[PDB]
Each structure stands twice: as C-alpha cells, then as structure tokens.
Amino acid sequence: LEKDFLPLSFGWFLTKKSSETLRKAGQVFLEELGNHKAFKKELRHFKEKLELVSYFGKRPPGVLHCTTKFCDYGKAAGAEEYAQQEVVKRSYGKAFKLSISALFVTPKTAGAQVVLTDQELQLWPSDLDKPSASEGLPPGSRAHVTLGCAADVQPVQTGLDLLDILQQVKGGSQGEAVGELPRGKLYSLGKGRWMLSLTKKMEVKAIFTGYYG
Ligand SMILES: [Cl-]
To answer: What's the Enzyme Commission number for this chain?
Structure first.
C-alpha cells in the first residue's frame, strides 16, 4: 500500500549547454532593454538608470527550466492527478526541443515565452490555477522559462505575467513596436510591461523529468 513521494515539480529541464545559452541571452536582453531610451523614459513603473539585472535579483539557481506541474511531493492540488497520466510516464526522461518566441519583463518578473509543440501540449496540465482558458487564450499559452524575479516575488508569478502580457497582445493592444533591439522588435504594453519578439525563434534542448529539490 505504501505511497510514493511525487517530485517537487515536473517540467522540461534545459541541458547545461542550452541553459547557459538562454541565460546569457536573457541577461543581454536586460542590459540592452535597460539602456533603451523608451524604457528609461518610463522608469516610473520600476542622472541615474536602472540596472535590470540587479532589479531581478532572484534567479533560478540550477539549470533553467520550463515547469509543467508544481506538485510539492503530492501536497499541491492535482499533483497525483497529473503524475499518474500515461503521457507523463511515457515522456519521463525523454529529450525535447523548446521553442522560445519572445523575452519579457514586468515590474515583478523576467522570462522567456515558450511555444509548445502539439506533443508537448499533452504534458501541459489541465487544472492550473488561473489557466489560459480563463482569459480566452489557448492552453499552454503561459508556458515559460523564468529568468529572474523581484525580491518579494514568487516564481509562479512569471506565468501570471506572461498570461497578462498575452491578453494585451491578443486583444490588439500590441500596437506597433516602440523600437528595436538586436534580436527583435521591442513592444511596450504599458505599466512596466515589455516584450522582445524574437526575429528568429530560439531553440533549447531539455529533458522532461521530475525535480525533487
Ligand atoms: Cl494554461
């Protein structure tokens, strides 16, 4: 009868090569964004400039990763429900490619938007608190890699911020780009929200597995 612990969370964990590449790309973005006059003009929402690398002080300590289901060893809602799925068991330990379409910043978080393939969507949970469907967006829209958080912000916030951004962008509030950074168009969504839409999507290798701490 004896029950088994679940992981702390399921997700795609980037290889060291991929993790370092994306981490470097994220840091260059914060450096460039912070230098951009359009960003400096609207510093209200955050002769001195703001170093965003310092602002987003809390970074993922290990390799970067895209979380599917936070489980807390079973103490999270729907953890056992998610973990016993056939597709989760089959995909365990398996290698995937994650497509990064954009990098974004809010006063709370910094992260990368992941656009899941159809296969990868099968690994996306259905019972997320405040899902994409709740905001008129397709499931898996809030898939992401967290690059950094403000001091009193928890990592789960990054998914909420991406969702909020995509609801702005969906409803035609994207507008025209305020400018351009090296690797894409820079969009200002107001209220401290910024998005860099990559000219060429970035691909990273990651293994779908369970994290225990
Ligand atoms: Cl979702």
So the answer is: 3.1.4.37
